[PDB]
Structures are given as structure tokens and as C-alpha cells.
Symmetry: D2
Subunit: 296 residues, 4 copies
């Protein structure tokens, strides 16, 4: 199977005067490349995919594809939806635009069954011939992709190569890699990046890496090289920022942190997302003081 | 405040050959009207709102509005989204089409904070001049509209007149009506229709009423007339079907039941929703046999 | 079946200088009787059963039995355990000491299966010839008595006449009384006292009644007399104190309130129970303010 | 600090004719010693502590101490309670009987606060001069020992040296060892033995090791020697038996498995524990077929 693994960043989407700040976006992606990131994830959850228009969806993928050309950095585009017909369209959309692969979140709100999840992803995988990474995050979607369903999709659809787990469930990560050790388990939960990698996970799709890409990059590759003491030390070091970056719903804290570090121009969200509380704004500001944040 | 209360039905959306069975849709609404229902809710969760096109959304609202024209039956149209700018558009859209009001689900997946939920619904309420009913279903959305946020929105916005609760939390229903007794609490969970009504709830948005509209309407009206013994008696009789209609994710069982009862011609869903398992197919069929199902 | 229903109080156990204040205990029980209570529950959870000696267990049961002589108030003694042989011993112990019935909590910590729970209660029920009330509180025990197991015990065991439910699950309360309407459902959660009674529950085992016995008694008796409007008015008025009495684990807040109202002499617990935070002490004091607290 | 770490077994307590089979108990302990186990845990949860008499508690402890004399195997005695005064007595009781340390479960059922948990364990730690390992298992106790409380207890009481975690929460295990790397994190969940060890945990208190002590011992010591690839291979292979051993509440499955392998004579529990269902009996028998089970 063709795969996209290693240290990866779920890109935030900076807004300026309510529109996508394109200059910014490209500059942020180049900053990721220059700090050892292996792939970037445009218009994912952290990029506020829910509140972007389809044309802004096209714009950010194209910018990501164009910025990583000539580099080893891959573009893993967010291309999921809770209606299979649209998810297939967004996948073909993502491929047509040069994405190296797609991250396709489990259908949200409408709670498909495991049989439905299988047919959903089976349709997406047969739509394009680029790698497909499943994304399981039940706290947001209301559904869970079972280990059996993930394994069946991995074995039945050739371009489905793994799953990004955001479920706080190291039991499930043992289950997945013990029964199907060929799949690429991807950490979608920054605080537990190292434990997932230490059990055979092959990368992270990180929120923290927006702010500290060099540290998330070093952690991942230490782990992939089985230097577990070095990876665990960074994982331990980063725990405080990993937790405070979810003081409020992601991506509210990470965008607040990026603004505090002068990496984005304005702290703008699209409703129903909003700026954090003032207590949290200060809490985020206090944790950042203990880390070294790379510039441009 | 202008309100829409009483026995209400979250209408299923029948498909035939992948298209909205428009004639069936109209016939199903007439069956609701003739069995004492007070309002119908087109293109809600039970209507597979997530997988309908915006023009199919329009068609079902228009069919619902005209089918109830000349009757007292009201149309509470589904018009929610997790992107505020889209939720405002669907609200004005629903008004334009003749809806008496809108049911607006809490933003799903992107987990807005309480501040964001407040701004989300305040933008929606200021979009139109028709009643707005909040819809709290945390198991689907990943977020909760707190009691304080519901009460604040009720007091600040003219058209926000209550909440449809589907959270299995009778405590919160006491919290809501004890601190704001003027609001319209609406049951969105058929099994506990009577306990919510007996505490001062003023209606139901029902899944079971698709199959048994006369039973759900009588239950609601017994309750509103303070004949709690008769409303509880129907609620107790309905428990078995109320539960089995969620053996799998709603609306997979209710559509199965409508097809088994010969009320729709084909048991078609739009992916990622699919037919139920064969064991649950048998369970729905067996529970249905103990209830009298009205024809057309 | 012989039953013990109505307004009932889970009695706190006052300590003075590390010993049971037996005269304060007596004063408290007499205060309960004179405010319309139908039964008292000595050495339950609210009475810190876990940290009392078996000899102090006897003292409090006997004091309760002696204090209720000449009145209609029954003694439903706490006599449960997670070891079946001990729970049977405590049951015979309770009868031998004059209790009218026993409240028997579901085995805690060791998580028996449904088959094990049935055999547990079947052994207890055959040990004595006084009424036995099941107590389901999964947040404390780690186990749940399923509706089927409760029903089986009610139908198979003569002294098992109902269940005290403290599970925040109004669905289960419908489930129970719809399939076995002859059983006595007793609310063990003060905040949802009225909805449980309105669904056919026949009493409450209350924490709040320690502080506000007249209000809990009136609520219950209005409800039993089918005066649902008055029962709901009291339930809504009590919501604030009903919630704050669980700001920390019961009985920490209720004892703090009993001390604040001058009803007990010392704010003493037995470890691992301790005084509340200084903020929760403050909140309890504020909330307490809004209610008229009967003296002796 | 003096510590007890490595591969450890939560010993089952075999019964024959309702009596502790003391002679099988000794035979089972010697089997653990001879298969590389570093410490044994008498009268814990897996040992059905709740249903043993205090005289059987002392008897099983003395057998454990006597069998491990002249060997490197330590006895970490179960000596916990939800009443601090009894837990202090049980601690003294354990020292008196020769135990090398105690495993002391968080108070169950009565849900003490963090402040109460602190004073509870501080009294126990100051009760004796032998190592104390905290035991956090919220699914059984109803309470959680927070990271802050564990850390405070570790720093303030010299004989408290770590915590056995049974909470399925790899985030918390990162939290613990990132903020206090000197403590001994011990796995209390067999399926995730490797991830806990790979993050710096120094041992396991295992259920599976009852049946496969050689495999659990090799797992732990591959891990302690940083041969993580070999430790992960054993963990992955044990996953199926690790999960099936909790098909029903522990220790019902492990005793069923021990009985199926001919390692104990009678499939006897003390109520409320009981034999498993016949479907789970068949499931346990089927998963066992894939492992080499060492005899006597
Ligand atoms: Mg290298
Ligand atoms: Mg192996």
C-alpha cells in the first residue's frame, strides 16, 4: 500500500477580515516544512473545515499542494463528510487538486452503523486511487469506527492504509496493531503521541505542531528510530502545552496560541467558534512562556 | 412569544429509486394530519437531512407546508447547521418557503463553547421573525447547550421559545423549567415523552408517531389536559416500540417499520445510512405486531 | 406484599468528639417524625454506614426503632453489603433489632453479574420475613441492577417489593413500571423526586429531607394524592438546594448544611470523609439561605 | 524509597466446599515463583477480598509470606478499605504478618474527595513502615485518585512509592510520570501492560499472569531491559486472552480459565460472584486454546 506517515500537522486556517488569509496560510505551511514536518493536513478539523466554503476548501488545498511541491512534504487533505455522496465528491475533488492523500473523518451527527461506515468508506476508497486515512474521533462525530471495521476496510480496500485515532483509548491501539500490524496507526491526540508511537504507530497528525513543529518532528522521528527515551522526554516536556491546547475546543486554543506567538495576524474564528475566555487566554499565555517557539 | 407546541412528528423522507418519493411524502403528511398531529417537522434528523440536497430540502418543506395548508397543523422545518453563516441561510430559506418555525440543531462536530452557541443561535434568531426551537442532542452533536445558555437565549431573543431535548437527562428538564417556567420544553426522546410532559413540557417531536401518530398525539394531549394517568398508560404501552425504534441509529428502524407496515414502498436510505441487520429487522417486525397501525 | 413507601429520610449520623452523638441522633429523628416523614433510613450511605462499627450500627437502628415507637413512622434500615454472607447477616441483624424493613444496596466494588445479583438478593430475601427494598446506585457501586433482574426479584421473592433508584435514568424508571407496575419505585435522587413520583413511583428516600423534612414530605404527599401541580411547585423550589447538597459527595454537603442550620453541634466526619472546600462551604451557605429550615 | 516492582500477580483465591483451599493456594503461589514472577498480591480484588473473612485474609497472607521465604518474591498484601480506621488496621495487620508491602485500593462506594483521599492514605502511610502502593480503579470504586493527589501523596509520605492504575487512561499515565518521574507506575490492566511499561512504568499487577505467568514475566522484563520489540510481541499476543479474561467481571473469567486448564479443582466463587454464562465459558475455553499454559 501507498502510505503517508511521519510527523504531520493539522493546519489552522488564519482569517483576516473574515476571509482566508492566503499569504498567511502559505507562510505557515512553509514554516512547517522548514521544521521537519513530513505532511500537512489542509482543511481538517483544526482548519475549521466546517465553516469554510467549498471554494475556500479548493483554495487551501491548492496552496498546500503548491507550497510542498519540490519537497518531500506530502499533502494529506481533509476530505470527509457525513453524506457518502459528498464525501466521494470531496475525495475526487482532493485528488483532482493534487493532494497526495485524504483524511476522511467518520460521518458525524447521523450515526451510521458499522455496516454503513464500511460502505461509506468503501465508496470513498473506490472513488480515487490515492491513499485514504480513516479518522476516528467519537467525541466529535457521535460514532465509533470499530477495530473490526477499520481492519476490514484496511484489508478490503487497497488504498485505505490506516487510521488517525483521537479516542484516548490505548487499549484500542493495542487491539488495532496486534491484529493488523501492517496498518499505519496515526496519533490524533498530542498528549499521547509517544505511547501510540511506542506501540507501533507510524506518525502523528498534530495540533501542537502548529506552534512547536520542531519538537513534534523530533519526537516522531526519535520514536520511529526507536530512540524511545528521547521521544518520551519530549512527550513529557510537551504535556503541559498539549493539555492547555485543549482548555477549550480545538482549534480555539491553538489559534489563540498562534496569535500570541505572532504567527498569525488576527485572532479570528468563524461562528459558532469564538475567541476563548479571558481566563483561558491567560492560561494559554502562561504555558507558552515555558517553551521555545520557532519563528519564520 | 409565538410558539409551536403539541404533538409533532419528525417526518421520515421516503426514497424511491434514489429520489424523494414526493407523492408518498405528501400522503404520509396527510396521515399525520388525520391522526391528530399538531405539527410536522420536515428534513430533520429522522428525515435524513444530512444526505438531502438543498433543493430536496426545499421540496420537502414546500410539500409539508402546502399539505398542511387549510388545516391547523403547523410546519416546524429543520433548518440547522454547524456553520452559523449556513444556519442563518437555512433559517431564511425555511421562512421563505412558508415554514411556521424552525427546529435548529446544536452545531455538531466542531464543539462550540457556550459563548459560541449563544452567538450562533442569536444570529439565527435575528435572521428571521418566525419561532426558533433549539435542539439539544449531545450524543449526536458532541456539545451540550447548557441550561444557562438555553435560558439566556430564551430571554434575549424574541423568537427563541424553547428547546427540544434528546439527552436522557430528566434532571436538566427540571433545571430548565424550574428556572425558566415560561419556556416550551419539547421531548425529543419518545421513551420518556410522558415524564417530560408531566413536568411541564409542552410537546414532543416524535419518531414513533411516524408509525403510531394517533397514539403519540393522544399521549401528548392527555398530558396537556393533565390526565396524567392516561398519558402514562400510553407511554408505558409504547415503551417497547419506543426502544426498538432505536435498536440501530434513528431513522434506520423507523423507516424499516414504515416499510414493514406498507406505509412506504421501498426501504431505501442514503449512505452512510443503510438497512438494519437481519436480527434487528426481525426485532422491529416482532415488536410492531403488538401495536395497531393506522392505514392511510 | 408488605411495603414501606412515602416520604423517607436517609438519616445523617452526627459525631461529637469522634463518637456517635446518640442524643443528637435521637433529636434529629424526632424532628423528622414531627415534619410528616413516613419512614427513616438509619445507617445508610447518608449515615456514613461504611465508617461505623457494627456495634454503632446496632445503636443507631435501635435508637431509630425506639424513637419511632408510638408513631406511624417505619424504620427501613440500611443492611446491605458486597459480600452475600454479610448482607444476609446484616438483614437478620436489622430484623432482630426491630426494623420494619431493610434497604439493601447493590454489591459495590466487586461488580457482580446479573446472575450474581439475583442470587445475592434471593439469599437476603429468604433470610428474613420483613420487606426488602433494592438500592441501585451505579455511580457508587460500579454495578447496575438491570430492570429484568429487579423484576425477577420482585416476582420471585416475597419480601422484595421495589427498588430505590439513584441512577439519573428516567428511561429506566419508565422501563421498570411499564413492565412491572406492581413494584414500588422509590426515588433516590432528590432533584428528580417529582418526575419519578409522577411516573408512578410511590416514595422518596431523601437527603434533602434531613434539612427540609416538611418540604420533602409535602412534595411526596401532594404527589401520592395526585396533586401534581403542588408536588412540582415544591420540586422546582427545592432544585437549588437539591443540587448544592451534592457539590461534594453526599453526605459532606448535607452535614455541612445541618451544621450551618445549627441542627448538629459539630461538623465532624469519619475519614476518608472530611469537611468540604471553603468555597463549597460558602456556596452551601448561600443556597441554604433561600429556604425556611424547621428547628426542633 | 523502598519499592516493590516488576512482574506481579493478583492471586486468585481457590475455594473447595466453601472453604479456602489453602493447599492449592500454596501450590498456585509456588507456580508463580517458578515462572519468573517478582511479587504476588494476596487477598486483592482478583483474590475476592470482599468475601473472605478477616481470618481467611490473615491465612492467605501468611501462606503467601511463607511460600516466598527464601526467594526473591515479595508479598504485596491487599490491605485497603473505604473506612480509614479499618484500612489502617489492615495495614498494620499486613506488616505484622510479614508482608513486604501493601496495595491499598482507593475507598470505594462512599466517594471521598481528593482532600479526603489525601488524609486517608496519609494515615495509612504513617501507620506502618512498609511500602504502600496506591490502587486506582475508578470503574470499581466510584472515585478517582487525581494525578495531583497521587503526586502529593508520593512526595509527602515517605513509604508511598507509586500507584497501580486500572483506569484505561494512557493520558493520565503520561501525566503521572511527566510531573513525577521518580514514582513507580504499575499497570493494573493486562491488555495495556506494554504501553504503560514503555512510558516508564516499572511493573504490572496482572490477572493474566495467574494463567500465563511465564509470558507476563517475560513481557515485563523484556520491557524493563528496554527490549521493547520483544515486550510488544508478547503483549500483542496476549491481547485476546487479556480481553476475554474480562468478558465478565474479574475474577470470574480467570477462575474459569484456571479451572479449564486444570490448575484449580473447583469453579467456586463466593456470592455475589458466580460462575460465568455458558456462552462466556465457551468463549474463554476457545481463546485459551491458542496459548501454552504451564502446569505444575
Ligand atoms: Mg535515524
Ligand atoms: Mg507471540
Amino acid at each position: 500500500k501507498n502510505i503517508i506517515i511521519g510527523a504531520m500537522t493539522a493546519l489552522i486556517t488564519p482569517f483576516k477580515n473574515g476571509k482566508v488569509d492566503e499569504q498567511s496560510y502559505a507562510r505557515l505551511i512553509k514554516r512547517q516544512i522548514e521544521n521537519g514536518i513530513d505532511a500537512v493536513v489542509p482543511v481538517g478539523t483544526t482548519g475549521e473545515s466546517a465553516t469554510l466554503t467549498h471554494e475556500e476548501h479548493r483554495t487551501c488545498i491548492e496552496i498546500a499542494v503548491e507550497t510542498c511541491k519540490g519537497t518531500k512534504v506530502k499533502v494529506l487533505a481533509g476530505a470527509g463528510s457525513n453524506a457518502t455522496h459528498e464525501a466521494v465528491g470531496l475525495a475526487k475533488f482532493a485528488k483532482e487538486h493534487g493532494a497526495d492523500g485524504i483524511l476522511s473523518v467518520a460521518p458525524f451527527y447521523n450515526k451510521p452503523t458499522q455496516q454503513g461506515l464500511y460502505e461509506h468508506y468503501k465508496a470513498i476508497a473506490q472513488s480515487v486511487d490515492i491513499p485514504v486515512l480513516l479518522y476516528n474521533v467519537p467525541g466529535r462525530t457521535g460514532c465509533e469506527i470499530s477495530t473490526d471495521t477499520i481492519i476490514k476496510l484496511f484489508r478490503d480496500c487497497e488504498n485505505i492504509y490506516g487510521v488517525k485515532e483521537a479516542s484516548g483509548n490505548i487499549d484500542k491501539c493495542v487491539d488495532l496493531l496486534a491484529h493488523e500490524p501492517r496498518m499505519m496507526l496515526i496519533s490524533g491526540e498530542d498528549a499521547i503521541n509517544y505511547p501510540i508511537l511506542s506501540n507501533g504507530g507510524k506518525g502523528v497528525i498534530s495540533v501542537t505542531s502548529n506552534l512547536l513543529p520542531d519538537m513534534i518532528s523530533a519526537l516522531t522521528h526519535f520514536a520511529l528510530d526507536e530512540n524511545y527515551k528521547e521521544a518520551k522526554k519530549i512527550n513529557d516536556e510537551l504535556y503541559n502545552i498539549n493539555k492547555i491546547l485543549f482548555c477549550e475546543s480545538n482549534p480555539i486554543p491553538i489559534k489563540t496560541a498562534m496569535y500570541l506567538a505572532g504567527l498569525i495576524e488576527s485572532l479570528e474564528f468563524r461562528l459558532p467558534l469564538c475567541s476563548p475566555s479571558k481566563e483561558n487566554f491567560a492560561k494559554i499565555e502562561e504555558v507558552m512562556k515555558k517553551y521555545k517557539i520557532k519563528g519564520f
